[PDB]
Structure 1
Amino acid sequence: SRQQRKAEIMESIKRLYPGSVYGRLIDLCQPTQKKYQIAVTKVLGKNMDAIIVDSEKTGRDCIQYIKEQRGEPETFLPLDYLEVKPTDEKLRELKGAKLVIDVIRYEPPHIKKALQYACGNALVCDNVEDARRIAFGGHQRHKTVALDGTLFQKSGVISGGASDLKAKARRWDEKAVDKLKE
């Protein structure tokens, strides 16, 4: 059971550096509705399992403690060390969509920087045609995702891949099942 020892080392680093290991990104955020569960899981990606810690010092400390325990390597986001750009406010004033970061809510309001880095100025649209329309029709193109998980990058690379996205979306409700069990 890899998840068991993963959560074991996770709780150990949670109790070692407690004012500075906020948690993973899944246990720290959830979307506004249930519809967007697919699209959010396509935009966050590996960042869903990224551990959110306060600064780079705690990052190296947790990494070396995982190495001492010979565990699975994990990904850390240091808030103070993270390179972000402020969320483009103009894109809230949009005809057919709003930003994916506005589609999710945090849990401690300090962690906003991490959700600026995992989302940026991504946008989410109801159907595929609307996503294509606001992504390519304006004079500035934007990274847009549809509700069914298809990703419209700025370069034009259409990304489809819902084979493993069903389980990644099922983790979102399985966390509620885990909360009701505990």
Structure 2
Amino acid sequence: RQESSRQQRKAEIMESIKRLYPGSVYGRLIDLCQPTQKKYQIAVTKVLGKNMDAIIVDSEKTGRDCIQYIKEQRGEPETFLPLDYLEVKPTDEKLRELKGAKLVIDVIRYEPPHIKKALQYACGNALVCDNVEDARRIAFGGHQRHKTVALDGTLFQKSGVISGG
């Protein structure tokens, strides 16, 4: 009811900000990437969570100026990742020898080359495993804990934080 109209206003301002600064504002992560299989849509969107709406921006400055204009527009706070200064870590690939699970980043097909670093920042070394039983065993069974998600969307990170939904 009321929330639907609110969502319409939010999506129209988001589109308006996208048109306002066309080159810098690439769009939402959905727009610029794709899940490989339909199966993994739920698990990928589950691991990303809040990151579903992260607007790709060139620079912090233009992001801020858009935030100012949005302040005039009375819009919800949004997240901008600037490719120039985004401080990402190289992909720890050493987990590719795990005989049961796979890297989550191995399930996204990205059209633009630059966005791969932001994808690494959003995924890190999160792992997607075949079933819940294996996911629990190889999440908690090592001396070090591992960030591991099962296909039903329960997420356990290396630090021991637990989340779901």
- Give structure 1 stretches of 5+ with no counterpart: 162-182
TM superposition shift of 1:8: 2.1
Between the aligned partners of 2:163 and 2:13, the Cα distance in structure 1 is: 34
Cα distance in 2 for residues equivalent to 1:142 and 1:82: 24
Shift of 1:149: 0.4
Q: Aligned with 1:19: secondary structure?
A: coil
Distance 1:160 1:56 in 2: 31
- Is 1:39 the counterpart of 2:46 in the alignment? no
- Give TM-score scaled by structure 1 length: 0.80
Instruction: Compute the displacement of 1:134 (Å).
Output: 2.2
Whether the 8 Å CA contact 2:145–2:160 is kept in 1: the answer is no
TM-score of the aligned structures, taking structure 2 as reference length: 0.87
Q: CA 1:87–1:5 in structure 2 vs 1: closer, same or farther (change >3 Å)?
A: same
Distance 2:96 2:66 in 1: 37
Report Cα offsets for 1:153-181 as digits up to 9, x if no partner: 223344332xxxxxxxxxxxxxxxxxxxx
Per-residue CA deviation, residues 119-172 of structure 1 (Å, 9 max, x unaligned), is 1110001111111222233343221000000112223344332xxxxxxxxxxx
- Compared CA separation, residues 68 and 152, structure 1 to 2 (3 A): same
1:73-123 deviation per Cα after TM superposition (whole angstroms, max 9, x unaligned): 222222222221111111223211111111112232211121111111100
Distance (Å, rounded) in 2 between the aligned partners of 1:79 and 1:92: 27
For 2:28 and 2:133, how far apart are their aligned partners in 1?
34
2:23 maps to which of 19, 25, 31 = 19
Question: How well do the aligned residues superpose, as a CA RMSD in angstroms?
Answer: 1.7
Specify the alignment match of 2:118 in structure 1. 114
CA displacement at 1:57 relative to structure 2: 1.2
Separation of aligned partners in 1, 2:69 and 2:120: 27
Aligned to 1:149: 153
Distance 1:61 1:116 in 2: 26
Query: Which deviates more from structure 2 when the two are superposed, residues 107-116 or residues 118-127?
Result: 107-116
CA distance in 1, matches of 2:28, 2:6: 16
How many residue pairs get matched? 161
- Is the Cα–Cα contact under 8 Å of residues 131 and 152 in structure 1 kept in the other structure? no
In 2, Cα distance between equivalents of 1:116 and 1:103: 12
1:48 is matched with 52
